Design a protein around this nucleic acid. Structure first.
Ligand SMILES: [Mg+2]
Ligand SMILES: [Mg+2]
Ligand SMILES: [Zn+2]
Ligand SMILES: [Zn+2]
Ligand SMILES: [Zn+2]
Lengths: 151, 94, 91, 95, 133, 257, 215, 214, 192
RNA sequence: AUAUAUUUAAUUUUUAUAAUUAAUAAUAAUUAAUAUAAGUACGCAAGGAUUGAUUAUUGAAAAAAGAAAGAAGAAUAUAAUUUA
RNA sequence: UUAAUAUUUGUUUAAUGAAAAGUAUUUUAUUAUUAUAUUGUAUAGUAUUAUUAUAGUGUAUAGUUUUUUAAAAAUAUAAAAAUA
């Protein structure tokens, strides 16, 4: 993300609406997922013992200044703003997963699973029954051939 | 990312007269990671006897394509790649 | 490239760049089995160090001997006795 | 060849073993053929609104009488299975 | 055009100089790797004597009966000694016009390198690579 | 949608800007990584100095970077100077990264593993407090007489923060090319790393033999037979290294400690 | 041709992370509507942006004393003023105007309308000043105007001359600029999300859901 | 190597530690992304003379070994030089490439065992004897202590076969106990420094020291 | 002039093709491409005599007859073969024909090798090979006896190895006791 | 198979600024698919015209008034993305 | 005059004994061993320091160390897509 030099409400809304495109991202995921988090930034954060988006969001402005003007992290402000912007829905995902659960429901989850297994069993039962009918028709052909040979 | 997008089946409905065309084709390549007006998507769709390689641009109101796998399936991507390669080499007249 | 020791036949692999084209035929390298400096000869060919222009990283690729040499020391039947101690994918 | 080609050949061999275990479908007999014909005729006369019932019966008779007698026994069984599919799926969209 | 590979791969059966190594005409020890004064003729066989190829000194690669060089650089083993084809076939001793008591042969299997065992060795070794197992 | 008025990648002029139109264009390799850049006359590429081939150009670049890391500076000519400066920046970037892949890449590129080690030892601590532009390029007012090409002095910036080259004076070269470089009076008591000191001592003692004097006189004879002017006669030549000169140079080296 | 991805691009037997919530476009649109109507987290309104002519490497050592003196200037209890990250404005040779990374000037058109030019650069390193989150925008802008006036009076006194918090900020801390940033209007209301119009009742439902999640 | 990112939380390897490597605490909610886990690259361990000799000494102590209990035996060994199970696996792979040890599979228990090759068994025995003599020369004791140790050795030698086996089991379990106790007082620091050989290849030079921790 | 040579990053095969130096373990094909008066490559030393002769004699008396390609494939199928090429096999068979060991008779469209001149000596050599196989079986029985002896020797090795393990663990034990006595001798005095 | 002369195509490098005139590249006798006028006019009848629209054929053009011995990039597409 | 011309441009060495040929001031060229007078050892040719390894033995890892230049046309080679 460019941000043109400063993080704005449009960038925060961008991150918020892109949070849908990452359902498996928890508040405890690694720091390389945040935008503009290069290898230098990630190594400096690991030196600071920062392995988590929560630990990035819990940083202080003085620590961010130290990381940006004494360590060499250019987009440290952008990484920190991204973390602070996305940290609040991540806590909800971790504690309950509200936006992920209230829209589907365990009832619909189990319904989908049961219908999936029933359809998968029916697909094979169709072939089982058609093979049974084929064997029955083969036996009927054998009986008809025996009758014709007797005739 | 590419490693998690390529290989996913895509259901594409294209509004065409007199009846919209409905296809299912796996992702072969993507041109942009995040959403963008130049996003792009490369899809290989194979019908009963027809094999085609579509490049669907994003944001067209007539070309409604949806990714449904939610996952990558790199092995399925490799299988579809080999199928398309064999079909493309076969289709040339000799 | 893949090199073997002249005295014992110990084999190790290492890609050769454009700055070491003179040392592609014969390498004077320390041998771990002989525990001293031995002469190493060129055995099989690897792909390259750099990239061929407008060609992928796989082109050209190693020969069948290099691919076979790796598969005997690291693979399904090779790492199976070693997947029970550490499972290298993990620590 | 390669590892992927070897795996593909092994998968094809397994599929061919399964297909060889499975038998050729069917050569239908007169009794079940007439049963299917009666089912088709009754289903048409039950749900055949705009299509001429006479023309439908003529088409079914023509099929059962000439198409199977012209084609091979395997295709006869394929036609039998397809007629059963039509009976179960409402003549295949014949409105 | 030459129709033979270069840098023969010995991954299937490595051809290395043994620690103990005697001559065929001399039955005396030779230098192992410090000097290439010996002549190595490898063929990938453990057949006695001197498995995975016998060895000759440069000066002694000559026939043992007539003490002369070889015609086409091909010697004949005779009860543990190396003879020449005119000696083995029973013909008369022919003095060569060129060098007498030494033959044209390279050192350290350089002359016998373009022919022998290459990769792959057997057929079951290629299927080991192309199979996932 | 339609196509641009000029379709396909068409070579433009040297000073023509970008077009910013949809065009299927592929790069030869990933030039974003250090020491893997491409040479060309567009702005996205390094200025390709003259060479018989891209392979020869890469060899010249490798020897340039090797000598640059060796003696902390290099006087080059023409379009070689921007390429040398950018490649020195790339080397410093790899050294500050300090990965095993970075070590292996700098070893693949350089001609001297000892110089690879020297770079990875010195440059991190030397340019820890710098963001970019680790090398300085100065266009000299004197030109190479043979081809009238513009000369450029390329060096590294943090001279004082370095272990080697701490206090070295480049206003004038040493008395001999095998002698240690000049040192300012203020930094006379400086000390060098022992491994680099031993390497330099070995390379310098290489030239203290009589076979080198014979090579020197034979080079005089060769260049005189090849038509090169202002080359004296091997009878009039005199050795670069003698006993009394070596004694006083050893005295000065012990003074500089 | 060549495919851009080799076989070893993804290790066999390893699964990748999922890139969307569900395969259903309706559920996708509902989750997108939730995340679009969500309140803007991590968004703060600074009362004033304070800037100095020095560099961030020189101001980091004094950033805490600046916080204390700004608290004393606001006349608030100690620990109510928070300083944002230091932003070093781009050292520009041409000086395009209006850019967020452009160095500030000691003059504005509203201040000197009849002036044929502007005054030279007054700030090169800036920092936002945030109050407590419970404070309203009215109190925020009041404190901002108060600090602006006090710092302007302190700069005038310094210019006329050569214990007060403003005098300390101007002399010891080297602070030479203060501005009031305009309200950010970048976030526009999503009237429709995914083509489906967002009703007032659905917007209130999403607001209540997010309020309960924050609670 | 950290306890949370490279291994599940709660586990720890009782072995030599790397010098100046902080054992920083990783939160429990930490998880890697499926794509980020692929591109992780570990530093190469030391498969050199000291680690291979240590592993060969363990494999000579336990004749034969099994790949499961090999790490436990290495941890019980007093002078452990291995860093972790990855270092152990790399040293095993290097020994297999050099030909010191071979890997077989028992058809009874369906488990992989590590046997010593007949051609290299003599060199392994020589290495073990040299290491024993070095440990004897380095170990310090008074006259009475040396006399008591010699008497105990003579008694263990004069004991029977099964008596010697039971004595060896008791001795190795007491060695395991005293090593677990002494580890709390001192550890083994492994230090490394990369360099490049004349062939342009990058390899590390390693030092192994002992440092007291209180 | 070659594209592979002008390419900035040369491949290993491209660098091999530049190995025109007459040296040990060099590019033999690239050195053979140049004329014989330029490259010092003498004739190929092909070992002839009884060593390949008896081998091909056994392999041919087994089948009697086989074609040349079949003989070469059957030989290559084995592990130890004194023959390096089908041309070497051809030269050995030609020398054997000259010495009246094998004779080649042409069928309707091919030639096959037979043993008719030395058929009695061929059967004698076959019986000698069979007796050598019987002696190999007797040596395998002697190797089973020597393996019982080696099991006894391995029991002795296990005895000395457990003694070495005891004397080593006792040394490690006393070293750890000394260390613990240096640090906190209470535990050492408790363990005695 | 030759630039020697003529003749042409360019150029003489930010010129804040085309256009009073010289000279100068596109002056329909188009073709093919549709559909509408219309199932009209016109024919004894079967039949059945003329016809301005979309595609099809895929391009766009302005001459002379300013300070000149580097790369019109300080070059890895930023007018210095922190910099000792 | 052509001619501000064409042409040259010295930044990286993979190989080993004669004779014809060549006489270039070898100042004592070598310093010695053996034995035994005398005699002679360095550099081709194609009008040249030139597309050039004179193939008489013999075999070999000594790297057995003179090729400028910052964009263009035409030409010369080499490569040159999922079009045919
Ligand atoms: Mg001008
Ligand atoms: Mg001449
Ligand atoms: Zn070795
Ligand atoms: Zn001999
Ligand atoms: Zn002879």
């Amino acid at each position: 993300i460019a941000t043109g030099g400063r993080v704005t409400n449009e960038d925060r809304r961008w991150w918020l609406v892109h949070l849908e495109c990452a359902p498996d991202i928890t508040p405890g995921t690694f720091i390389a997922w945040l935008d503009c988090c290069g290898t230098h930034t990630c190594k400096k954060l690991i030196e600071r013992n920062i392995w988590t988006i929560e630990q990035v969001a819990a940083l202080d402005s003085d620590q961010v200044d130290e990381l940006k003007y004494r360590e060499g992290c250019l987009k440290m402000d952008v990484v920190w703003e991204h973390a602070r912007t996305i940290i609040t829905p991540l806590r909800q995902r971790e504690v309950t997963g509200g936006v992920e659960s209230e829209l589907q429901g365990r009832i619909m989850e189990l319904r989908k699973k049961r219908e999936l297994e029933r359809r998968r069993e029916e697909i094979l039962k169709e072939r089982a029954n058609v093979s049974e009918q084929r064997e029955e028709t083969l036996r009927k052909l054998r009986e008809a051939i025996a009758a014709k040979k007797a005739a | 990312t590419k490693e998690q997008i390529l290989g996913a089946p895509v259901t594409c409905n294209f509004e065409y007269n007199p009846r919209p065309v409905r296809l299912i084709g796996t992702v072969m390549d993507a041109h942009t990671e995040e959403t963008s007006i130049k996003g792009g998507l490369k899809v290989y769709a194979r019908n009963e006897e027809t094999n085609m390689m579509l490049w669907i641009p994003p944001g067209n109101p007539k070309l409604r394509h949806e990714v449904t796998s939610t996952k990558g399936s790199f092995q399925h991507y490799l299988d579809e790649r080999d199928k398309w390669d064999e079909a493309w080499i076969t289709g040339r007249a000799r | 490239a893949l090199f073997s020791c002249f005295r014992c036949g110990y084999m190790y692999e290492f890609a050769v760049s454009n700055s070491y084209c003179r040392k592609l035929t014969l390498r004077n390298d320390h041998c771990p089995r002989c525990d001293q400096l031995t002469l190493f000869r060129f055995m099989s060919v690897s792909g390259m160090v750099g990239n061929m222009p407008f060609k992928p990283i796989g082109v050209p690729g190693p020969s069948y001997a290099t691919l076979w040499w790796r598969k005997t020391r690291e693979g399904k039947e090779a790492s199976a006795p070693l997947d029970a101690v550490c499972k290298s994918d993990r620590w | 060849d390669f590892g992927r080609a070897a795996a593909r050949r092994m998968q094809l061999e397994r599929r061919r073993l399964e297909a060889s275990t499975h038998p050729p479908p069917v050569d239908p007999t007169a009794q079940q053929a007439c049963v299917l014909y009666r089912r088709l005729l009754k289903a048409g006369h039950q749900q055949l609104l705009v299509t001429d019932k006479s023309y439908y019966a003529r088409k079914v008779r023509h099929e059962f009488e000439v198409t199977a007698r012209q084609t091979s026994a395997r295709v006869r069984g394929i036609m039998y299975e397809r007629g059963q599919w039509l009976v179960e799926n409402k003549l295949g969209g014949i409105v | 055009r030459p129709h033979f590979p270069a840098y023969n791969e010995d991954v299937d059966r490595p051809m290395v100089v043994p620690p103990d190594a005697i001559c065929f005409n001399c039955d005396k020890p030779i230098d192992a790797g410090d000097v290439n004064s010996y002549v190595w003729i490898p063929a990938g066989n453990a057949t006695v004597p001197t498995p995975q190829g016998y060895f000759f000194h440069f000066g002694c690669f000559k026939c043992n009966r007539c003490k002369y060089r070889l015609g086409h650089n091909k010697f004949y083993s005779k009860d543990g000694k190396a003879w020449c084809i005119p000696c083995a076939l029973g013909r008369d001793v022919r003095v060569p016009t060129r060098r007498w008591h030494t033959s044209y042969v390279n050192t350290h299997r350089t002359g016998s390198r373009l022919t022998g065992h290459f990769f792959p060795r057997h057929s079951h070794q290629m299927e080991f690579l192309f199979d996932p197992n | 949608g339609r196509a641009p008025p000029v379709i396909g990648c068409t070579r433009k002029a040297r000073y023509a800007g970008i077009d910013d139109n949809p065009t299927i264009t592929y790069k030869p390799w990933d030039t974003t990584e250090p020491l893997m850049a491409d040479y060309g006359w567009t702005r996205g590429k390094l200025p390709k100095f003259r060479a018989r081939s891209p392979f020869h150009r890469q060899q010249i670049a490798r020897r340039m970077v090797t000598e640059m890391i060796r003696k902390d500076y290099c006087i080059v000519g023409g379009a070689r100077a921007p390429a040398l400066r950018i490649l020195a920046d790339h080397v410093v970037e790899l050294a500050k990264a300090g990965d095993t892949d970075s070590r292996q890449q700098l070893a693949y590129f350089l001609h001297d593993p000892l110089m690879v080690d020297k770079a990875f030892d010195e440059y991190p601590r030397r340019f820890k407090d710098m963001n970019a532009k680790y090398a300085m390029m100065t266009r000299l007012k004197s030109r190479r007489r043979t081809d009238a090409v513009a000369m450029y002095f390329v060096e590294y910036k943090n001279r004082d923060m370095s272990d080697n080259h701490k206090g070295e004076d480049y206003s004038a070269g040493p008395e001999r090319f095998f002698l240690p470089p000049r040192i300012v009076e203020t930094e006379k008591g400086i000390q060098r790393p022992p491994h680099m000191q031993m390497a330099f001592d070995r390379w310098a003692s290489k030239f203290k033999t009589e076979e080198f004097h014979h090579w020197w006189r034979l080079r005089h004879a060769k260049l005189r037979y090849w038509g090169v002017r202002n080359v004296p006669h091997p009878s009039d030549v005199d050795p670069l290294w003698t006993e009394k000169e070596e004694e006083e140079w050893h005295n000065e080296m012990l003074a500089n400690t | 041709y060549y495919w851009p991805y080799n076989e070893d691009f993804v290790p066999e037997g390893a699964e990748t992370s999922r890139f969307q919530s569900s395969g259903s476009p309706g559920t996708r649109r509902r989750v997108l509507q939730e995340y679009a109507l969500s309140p803007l987290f991590g968004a703060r309104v600074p009362c004033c942006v304070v800037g100095t002519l020095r560099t961030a490497k020189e101001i980091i050592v004094l950033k805490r004393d600046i916080q204390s003196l700004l608290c004393e200037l606001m006349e608030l209890p100690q620990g109510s003023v928070t300083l944002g990250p230091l932003q070093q404005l781009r050292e520009m040779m041409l000086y395009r105007h209006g850019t967020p990374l452009s160095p500030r000037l000691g003059d504005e058109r509203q201040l000197n309308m009849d002036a044929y030019a502007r005054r030279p650069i007054a700030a090169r390193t800036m920092m936002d000043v945030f109050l407590a989150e419970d404070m309203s925008l009215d109190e925020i802008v009041n404190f901002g105007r108060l600090s602006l006036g006090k710092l302007q009076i302190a700069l005038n006194n310094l210019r006329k001359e050569n214990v007060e918090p403003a005098q300390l900020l101007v002399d010891r801390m080297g602070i030479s600029y203060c501005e009031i940033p305009s309200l950010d209007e970048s976030d526009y209301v999503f009237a429709e999300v995914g083509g489906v119009a967002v009703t007032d009742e659905e917007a209130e439902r999403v607001a209540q859901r997010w309020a309960e999640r924050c609670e | 190597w950290q306890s949370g990112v490279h291994t599940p939380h709660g586990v720890v390897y009782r072995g030599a530690k790397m010098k100046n490597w902080p054992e920083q605490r990783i939160p429990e909610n930490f998880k890697f992304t499926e794509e980020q886990r692929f591109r992780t690259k570990a530093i190469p361990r030391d498969v050199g003379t000291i680690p291979r000799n240590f592993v060969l000494g363990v494999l000579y102590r336990h004749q034969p070994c099994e790949v499961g209990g090999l790490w436990e035996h290495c941890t019980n060994d007093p002078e452990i030089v291995l860093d972790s199970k990855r270092h152990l696996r790399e040293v095993l792979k290097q020994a297999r490439e050099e030909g010191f040890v071979t890997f077989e599979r028992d058809a009874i228990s369906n488990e992989w065992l590590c046997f010593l090759t007949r051609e290299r068994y003599e060199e392994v025995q020589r290495i073990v004897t040299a290491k024993s003599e070095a440990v004897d020369t380095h170990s310090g004791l008074r006259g009475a202590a040396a006399t008591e140790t010699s008497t105990y050795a003579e008694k263990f030698r004069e004991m029977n076969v099964e008596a010697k086996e039971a004595h060896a089991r008791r001795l190795e379990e007491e060695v395991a106990n005293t090593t677990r106790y002494l580890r709390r007082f001192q550890q083994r620091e492994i230090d490394y420094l990369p360099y490049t050989d004349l062939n342009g290849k990058v390899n590390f030079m390693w030092w192994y020291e002992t440092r007291d921790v209180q | 002039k070659e594209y592979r040579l002008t390419v900035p990053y040369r491949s290993e095969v491209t660098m091999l093709r530049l190995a025109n130096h007459k040296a040990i373990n060099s590019n033999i094909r690239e050195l053979f491409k140049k004329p014989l008066v330029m490259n010092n490559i003498k004739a190929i030393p092909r070992d002839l005599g009884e060593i390949p002769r008896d081998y091909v004699l056994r392999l041919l008396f087994f089948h009697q007859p086989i074609r040349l390609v079949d003989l070469w494939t059957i030989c290559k199928e084995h592990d130890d073969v004194p023959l390096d090429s089908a041309k070497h096999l051809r030269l050995v068979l030609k020398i054997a024909k000259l010495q009246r060991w094998v004779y080649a008779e042409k069928n309707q469209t091919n030639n096959l090798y037979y043993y008719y001149v030395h058929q009695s000596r061929m059967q004698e050599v076959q019986q000698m090979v069979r007796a050598s196989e019987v002696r190999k079986k007797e040596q395998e029985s002697v190797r089973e006896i020597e393996a019982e002896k080696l099991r006894m020797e391995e029991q002795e090795r296990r005895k000395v190895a457990l003694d070495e393990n005891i004397v080593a663990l006792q040394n490690a034990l006393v070293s750890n006791i000394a260390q613990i006595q240096e640090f906190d001798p209470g535990f050492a005095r408790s363990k005695i």
